[PDB]
Amino acid sequence: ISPIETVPVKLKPGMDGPKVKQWPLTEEKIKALVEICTEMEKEGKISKIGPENPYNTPVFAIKKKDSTKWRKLVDFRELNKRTQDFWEVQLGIPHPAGLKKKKSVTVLDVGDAYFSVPLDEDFRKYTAFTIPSINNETPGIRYQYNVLPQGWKGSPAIFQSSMTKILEPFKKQNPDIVIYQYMDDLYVGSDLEIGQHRTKIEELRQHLLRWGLTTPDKKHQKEPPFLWMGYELHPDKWTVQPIVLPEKDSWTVNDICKLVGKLNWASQIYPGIKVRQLSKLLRGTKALTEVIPLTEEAELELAENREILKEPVHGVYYDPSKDLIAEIQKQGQGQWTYQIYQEPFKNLKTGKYARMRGAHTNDVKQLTEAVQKITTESIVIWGKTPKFKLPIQKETWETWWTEYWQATWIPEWEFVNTPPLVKLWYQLEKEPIVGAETFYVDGAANRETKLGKAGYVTNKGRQKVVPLTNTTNQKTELQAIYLALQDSGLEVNIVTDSQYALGIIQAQPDKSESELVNQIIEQLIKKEKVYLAWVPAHKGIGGNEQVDKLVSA
Amino acid sequence: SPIETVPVKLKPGMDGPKVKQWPLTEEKIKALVEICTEMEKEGKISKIGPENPYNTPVFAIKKKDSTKWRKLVDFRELNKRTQDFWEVQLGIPHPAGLKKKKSVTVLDVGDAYFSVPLDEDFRKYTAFTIPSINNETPGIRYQYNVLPQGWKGSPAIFQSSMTKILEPFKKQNPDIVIYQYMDDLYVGSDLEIGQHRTKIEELRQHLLRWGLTTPGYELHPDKWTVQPIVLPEKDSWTVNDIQKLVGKLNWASQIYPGIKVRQLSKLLRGTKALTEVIPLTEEAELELAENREILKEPVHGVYYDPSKDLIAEIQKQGQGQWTYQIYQEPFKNLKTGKYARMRGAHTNDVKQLTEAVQKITTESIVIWGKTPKFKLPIQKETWETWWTEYWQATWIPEWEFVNTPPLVKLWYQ
DNA sequence: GCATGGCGCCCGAACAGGGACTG
DNA sequence: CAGTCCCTGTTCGGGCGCCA
Ligand SMILES: Cc1cn([C@H]2C[C@H](N=[N+]=[N-])[C@@H](COP(=O)(O)OP(=O)(O)OP(=O)(O)OP(=O)(O)OC[C@H]3O[C@@H](n4cnc5c(N)ncnc54)[C@H](O)[C@@H]3O)O2)c(=O)[nH]c1=O
Ligand SMILES: [Mg+2]
Numbered sequence A: 001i002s003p004i005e006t007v008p009v010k011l012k013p014g015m016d017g018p019k020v021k022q023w024p025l026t027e028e029k030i031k032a033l034v035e036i037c038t039e040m041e042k043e044g045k046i047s048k049i050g051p052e053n054p055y056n057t058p059v060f061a062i063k064k065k066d067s068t069k070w071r072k073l074v075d076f077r078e079l080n081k082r083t084q085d086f087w088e089v090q091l092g093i094p095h096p097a098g099l100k101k102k103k104s105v106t107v108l109d110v111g112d113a114y115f116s117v118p119l120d121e122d123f124r125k126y127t128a129f130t131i132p133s134i135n136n137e138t139p140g141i142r143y144q145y146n147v148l149p150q151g152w153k154g155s156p157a158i159f160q161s162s163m164t165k166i167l168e169p170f171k172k173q174n175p176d177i178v179i180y181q182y183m184d185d186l187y188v189g190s191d192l193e194i195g196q197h198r199t200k201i202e203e204l205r206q207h208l209l210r211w212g213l214t215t216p217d218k219k220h221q222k223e224p225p226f227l228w229m230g231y232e233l234h235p236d237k238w239t240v241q242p243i244v245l246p247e248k249d250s251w252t253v254n255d256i257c258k259l260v261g262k263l264n265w266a267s268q269i270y271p272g273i274k275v276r277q278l279s280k281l282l283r284g285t286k287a288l289t290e291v292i293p294l295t296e297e298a299e300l301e302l303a304e305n306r307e308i309l310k311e312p313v314h315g316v317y318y319d320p321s322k323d324l325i326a327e328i329q330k331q332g333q334g335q336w337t338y339q340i341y342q343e344p345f346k347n348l349k350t351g352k353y354a355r356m357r358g359a360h361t362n363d364v365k366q367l368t369e370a371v372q373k374i375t376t377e378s379i380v381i382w383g384k385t386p387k388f389k390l391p392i393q394k395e396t397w398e399t400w401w402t403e404y405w406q407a408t409w410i411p412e413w414e415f416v417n418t419p420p421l422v423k424l425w426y427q428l429e430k431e432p433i434v435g436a437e438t439f440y441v442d443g444a445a446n447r448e449t450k451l452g453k454a455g456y457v458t459n460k461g462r463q464k465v466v467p468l469t470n471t472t473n474q475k476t477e478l479q480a481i482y483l484a485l486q487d488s489g490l491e492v493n494i495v496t497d498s499q500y501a502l503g504i505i506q507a508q509p510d511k512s513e514s515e516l517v518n519q520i521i522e523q524l525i526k527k528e529k530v531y532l533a534w535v536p537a538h539k540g541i542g543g544n545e546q547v548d549k550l551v552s553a
Numbered sequence B: 001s002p003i004e005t006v007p008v009k010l011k012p013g014m015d016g017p018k019v020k021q022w023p024l025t026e027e028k029i030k031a032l033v034e035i036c037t038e039m040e041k042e043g044k045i046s047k048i049g050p051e052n053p054y055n056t057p058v059f060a061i062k063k064k065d066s067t068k069w070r071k072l073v074d075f076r077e078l079n080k081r082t083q084d085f086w087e088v089q090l091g092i093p094h095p096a097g098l099k100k101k102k103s104v105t106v107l108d109v110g111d112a113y114f115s116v117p118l119d120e121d122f123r124k125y126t127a128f129t130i131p132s133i134n135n136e137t138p139g140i141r142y143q144y145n146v147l148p149q150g151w152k153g154s155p156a157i158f159q160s161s162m163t164k165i166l167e168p169f170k171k172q173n174p175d176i177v178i179y180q181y182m183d184d185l186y187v188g189s190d191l192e193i194g195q196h197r198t199k200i201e202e203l204r205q206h207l208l209r210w211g212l213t214t215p216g217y218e219l220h221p222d223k224w225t226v227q228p229i230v231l232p233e234k235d236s237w238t239v240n241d242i243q244k245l246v247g248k249l250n251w252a253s254q255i256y257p258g259i260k261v262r263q264l265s266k267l268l269r270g271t272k273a274l275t276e277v278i279p280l281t282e283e284a285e286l287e288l289a290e291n292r293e294i295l296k297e298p299v300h301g302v303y304y305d306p307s308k309d310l311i312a313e314i315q316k317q318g319q320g321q322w323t324y325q326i327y328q329e330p331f332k333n334l335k336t337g338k339y340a341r342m343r344g345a346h347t348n349d350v351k352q353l354t355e356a357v358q359k360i361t362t363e364s365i366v367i368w369g370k371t372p373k374f375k376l377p378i379q380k381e382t383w384e385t386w387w388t389e390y391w392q393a394t395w396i397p398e399w400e401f402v403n404t405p406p407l408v409k410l411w412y413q
Numbered sequence C: 001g002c003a004t005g006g007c008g009c010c011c012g013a014a015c016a017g018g019g020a021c022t023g
Numbered sequence D: 001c002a003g004t005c006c007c008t009g010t011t012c013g014g015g016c017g018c019c020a
């Protein structure tokens, strides 16, 4: 029974305890479960309860890593609804790439960790449960937890929290030891003599026992191939644990999830990973079991990546004396890849970034987003933002940030040549083009019928109007600009009362999710001098007027 | 110091703050660790567990000439929900004279609040969590035991003591104005700059007699110009120019009702060419100048309304210039300025905007003793990533992000 | 009638806000 | 002026990955 002081817990005002009945279990389960409760009973983890306790919560079991034994869980879902909130302390997950090299290293793990911290007394009642007989022919036995149960939303937090308080004393008196605690999984590293270390490890392992924390000898002792957080930490490198992709003929939705999930975990270190085609399959709303025909474009990816994982890589460690560099490359349309290293090819961590934000953007923008993403992620791992090497010319960027209306910025970065390169695919003109047919575009639709017209009317005399089906006053506006762009030469002067359209265009987008806007872009690339100007909408302006009367019959 | 803590009531039915903490650079994590462990020993704060559902983010900043770091908590939230308490019940008056003084300086008396203890029940709401690099460890949680800095309540509870502390100074120098905005103290006078600085220094000492550590910076409310909109002066007018012009006039027309343009409109009549030059007609010349006069005379209908939220907009110009407008309702500007190419700021659009924002927030405090809500012209993740590296004030304004291309170029610049 | 906390990625629904149009 | 639309951005839930 642990001396560690318990943490006061209450339920939400007006809510009583859980009164949900136990659902029947399987023969083997009821079998293992009773072997467990018996052992907990004696140890003092749980307690046999009288009939005066009106509560109950269904319980069940699940096999562990090597499938020797079982894990007793409790479906405290109803209890989590009623119980008080907590504020979580685990803010993130440690990364091997942020690990430093150390003379000696060890990694322990507290056995049965939850079952060694005292649950607040008053709360225990609500944690009551029942275990049936073999075939439910004799009333079962009521029990309640006196320790942290598995399935209560408060556990992980209380535990993690109680653990740091126990390690606080030891960590202060040993400022020279670095310890990474994640739940009950400890990693102790030091630059102490190989033997002195083993002494601290003993001095420590014996510190937990004093606080009730067991330390089974089943732990990485002077074992270079350390298994921490699903990684293989070697003396001067680190890798991820064997990563096996699902291999099957017919794929269901869920199957693909379980496939992309893993490929992302891979991107952490395997470079060049891409999952854009693969996930596209997940569009629309579909069931986990809905079987979906693997597409052609995705078949390329699913295979491409599979070729990448065939040839294993490894990660290196970090040292504070050298700055960090993160180089990035543009992998597909919308996709990007990046690797952070401290030396030439000495990689410390790789990564993918593929969120195509917004309806319309451009490589510069999507690039800027990636730098930001990496900048942040690196501050979490190393607490300092790294140096960049980006595939974009210094003059390109400088052309963009001065012209763009939003404030924008990229930290310390040098150039790197590796196609494809980022660049603006065109540039509207600052001043009107001399000696050029000027198009006065506009359009409109009757939002009540979806019918609509789009057209232009030039100074030279040109003129046209096109009827449209299923369109809106905004789309129309665009459509119109499309026409004026087609029916023009390499130099053009277009004018519109469309703040919307003008909005998109000026941002120099090079990709979009809009058919129409994709075509406009394409056409804009083909010209040599474009110039769009804006005028008030239903003013009597010169040319606008006319096209207006035309488009709205 | 055993004292009777004023009870802090909360907005009825208000849930305390629950904000996640954000990543922190190594240098500012180690600064925060140091800062907090001494605060823990000095008893200002107390360690706590995960049983306290609340939370507010923390970070830290190093200001000008101060090598010592300063802790800063974003009680931006806990302030919106305790507003009843500090604006109504224990409100503190705003002198409308300060905006008129020849010189004003800002002192950091925030330290002084650490003296008074905080009401036991309200402590759980000031909870904060310190992160660890590479998540070597879970978050360490702390809560305040004394008036913290950053909460709008603190300067409201300490007003009684402040009145006193400053009573003898207001007597000997009945011609200076003191205003207390949160962690700040704003002292304004019409004295000459060299002696003004000394009155500030006799005041700093005056605060020393009670134990308050008061660690281009002087302000000048009289030198702040509300620069208006102006129309260009061209020799020959192109069709394009006359267009853009109307574009602006029709727009600026929502401001003043007098601007007419129907006379400048008849000029474009008929699909012409953009580069086509057009003779400057007299029907226009009259009305053009006619409008040019309306835009000089100050807009009629301006008025401040304490009962309404203040709003600031900034436009990015280029070459380091920025323009802003503070208002409560569309087209009824209270003031509009033009932040210039700050001599010393790097070519960092974000570092610049960050600076502009703090100027506005400051001007805003002096003029109406209230902070504005900003409409920043930058993308959230872009700003969210670097705004803290450049911040140097002790308060944080409520901002929202907006993206809106430039119609009629920028009428304001 | 098959649990909990954390972080990541990806997709979509719900929601909010500004400009243009409509009666 | 107030009520509809359309377009768009931001938030939050659910599912998978990985850890405990
Ligand atoms: C996996 C899991 C964890 N948890 C919560 C509650 C749980 N505490 N408890 N009880 C705590 C830690 O779980 P852990 O898996 O460490 O088990 P626990 O702390 O319960 O006890 P113990 O560690 O003794 O677990 P066993 O399954 O009995 O032993 C397996 C352990 O032995 C070590 N081990 C065995 N063989 C080796 C080897 N060759 N090399 C290195 N380590 C080894 C290894 O760390 C593994 O966890 O996280 C949860 O809520 N749900 C889950 O599904
Ligand atoms: Mg364990």
Ligand SMILES: [Mg+2]
Pocket: A442, A443, A444, A497, A537, A548
């Ligand atoms: Mg129109």
